[PDB]
Ligand binder design. Structure first.
Ligand SMILES: CC(=O)Nc1cccc(CNC(=O)C2CCN([C@H](C)c3cccc4ccccc34)CC2)c1
Ligand SMILES: CC(=O)Nc1cccc(CNC(=O)C2CCN([C@H](C)c3cccc4ccccc34)CC2)c1
Ligand SMILES: [Zn+2]
Ligand SMILES: [Zn+2]
Lengths: 315, 287
């Protein structure tokens, strides 16, 4: 007749919701889309081994919608489904510790995430969504599948898709605490005069255009609207890091003068990322592969630098 | 007092007057009678903007101080922006939004989009800039801006199923939702995506991916610039990755090109970066 078991559904693995299930129905019928440790179990009927387990459902009642928002800080209805679908893959990657950092053995065209994950472990960053804070702790410890799947979901990228690092840090920074970050710039044009500007949030820690923090501090040449080239330079920065990005170009990472950088060999549709880190010397981390050198020149796209408080001396 | 111009609180901390940062200015006599640091302002601000960035309002105000000085003529029935401050990407975005079926979630974007369609896009422009985390005058990209705004749009009814056939692995159907359901990066042609484009598979071979099923009111196809009544609209980019200019192409009674200026033609070939197509329900025929 009626054969049934007890489960918990959840969206955050924090609030669990007891349900009973008629074994005579596949999970979807009773819950909608249903997952077991990443596996889409919507179309399976309950096993005796399921008694007492926990299942992610979708926020299909008002209570779950609010819990999901408090945990993930997103209101895209498809977020949890897209996250779970990614997790079915990221749980299958291997995440070896290479030079003290969690990287990822190459799989499923994930080179940009490996380099993002290594970068994330070297910069001062506290996340706001509890899901990312929790998954990031796990990632730093070496169990990074959930972290990788959440980055994919927040970035609207699917498993196997070609990725760009600059876009990922910007997406993640929208979800990071940059409250104390401050950037002050002056732009001096021989025609137009001087203009100071203050920037906040992601733009206060990100600049696209030069890899050299020294050149940014000294002044970089950009076009002015009057037609002249003006020079823009950094007057004041209060932040724990900066990220500099540019189209891939041959570049000289010198030991000890930056934190880490990303190297891109390829073209705009297909290319490969490697991570370069400055430790006692220069290490090139490529998934599980590791190399060392005293100097480096290669096709660099992003350079990260340490910071606390900077004020220019150029008046 | 206010953070949203809807919920008012009788009364400072950070203070703004019609876009100009006046926190550090003292009131003038002409000012008589006219940041979210308490719970009333925190709740009102979140319900209106759908962001919890503490710095959001400062960047929105800074942008509005500039965008209120732009001019916004109606060209071929759409609000554009007369050129100022390297706003060609913002101009092309505003012309594009008014031409496809899309519903916003933050009350701020619906309200600003409605005002913009009527001709008052200053508030709308400061909101686009804040959501895309750009300051006024910055060089912008259509694909990136659209990715951020679609992140803030109701694309809930959109669904996409694709199949990938690899000579080693077999066939795999994959389902996408939200932004990935309406955007494809790799080809400008919806027809080729429906018929199939060759892209890499995880085993290292190049595989062929084609569209099995699409349910949505529009699609956006983008690719790096190349020479290129069959589409709704597209963006044309002249330049290189660091410096260039956007124009807009709309397919109506003929093909019209709006560049902040407007011309027409019966045929069109140029350096296209993004192309837009109409949809309701499409299903492929390889069965
Ligand atoms: C719109 C569209 O069609 N996107 C698309 C299509 C197919 C595959 C991919 C996935 N690959 C990417 O997204 C890349 C994007 C960025 N770059 C670096 C940072 C890079 C930066 C600047 C200039 C570059 C100029 C040349 C090469 C790289 C440049 C890394 C990879 C994306
Ligand atoms: C904080 C700050 O200042 N950020 C900043 C700085 C500089 C520039 C920009 C924005 N950059 C852009 O908008 C262009 C860049 C990319 N694409 C083009 C279509 C494009 C697409 C694909 C391959 C390409 C391959 C080669 C060339 C172009 C390619 C769109 C426009 C932002
Ligand atoms: Zn000038
Ligand atoms: Zn394969």
């Amino acid at each position: 007749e009626v054969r049934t078991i007890k489960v918990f559904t959840t969206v955050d693995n924090i609030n669990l919701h007891t349900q009973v299930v008629d074994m005579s129905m596949t999970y979807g019928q009773q819950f909608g889309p249903t997952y077991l440790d990443g596996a889409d179990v919507t179309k399976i009927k309950p096993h005796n081994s399921h008694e007492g387990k926990t299942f992610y459902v979708l926020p299909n009642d008002d209570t779950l919608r609010v819990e999901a928002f408090e945990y993930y800080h997103t209101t895209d209805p498809s977020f949890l489904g897209r996250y779970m679908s990614a997790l079915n893959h990221t749980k299958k990657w291997k995440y070896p510790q290479v030079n003290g950092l969690t990287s990822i053995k190459w799989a499923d065209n994930n080179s940009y995430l490996a380099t993002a994950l290594l970068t994330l472990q070297q910069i001062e960053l506290k996340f706001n969504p509890p899901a990312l804070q929790d998954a990031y702790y796990r990632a730093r410890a070496g169990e990074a599948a959930n972290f990788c799947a959440l980055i994919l979901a927040y970035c609207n990228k699917t498993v196997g898709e070609l990725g760009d690092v600059r876009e990922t840090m910007s997406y993640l920074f929208q979800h990071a605490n940059l409250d104390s970050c401050k950037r002050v710039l002056n732009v001096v044009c021989k025609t137009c005069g001087q203009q100071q500007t203050t920037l906040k949030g992601v733009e206060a820690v990100m600049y696209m255009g030069t890899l050299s923090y020294e050149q940014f501090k000294k002044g970089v040449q950009i076009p002015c609207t009057c037609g002249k080239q003006a020079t823009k330079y950094l007057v004041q920065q209060e932040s724990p890091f900066v990220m500099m990005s540019a189209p891939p170009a041959q570049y000289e990472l010198k030991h000890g003068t930056f934190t880490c950088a990303s190297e891109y060999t390829g073209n705009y549709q297909c290319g490969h990322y490697k991570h370069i880190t400055s430790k006692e010397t220069l290490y090139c981390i490529d998934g599980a592969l590791l190399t060392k050198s005293s100097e480096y020149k290669g096709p660099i796209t992003d350079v990260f630098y340490k910071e606390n408080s900077y004020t220019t001396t150029i008046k």
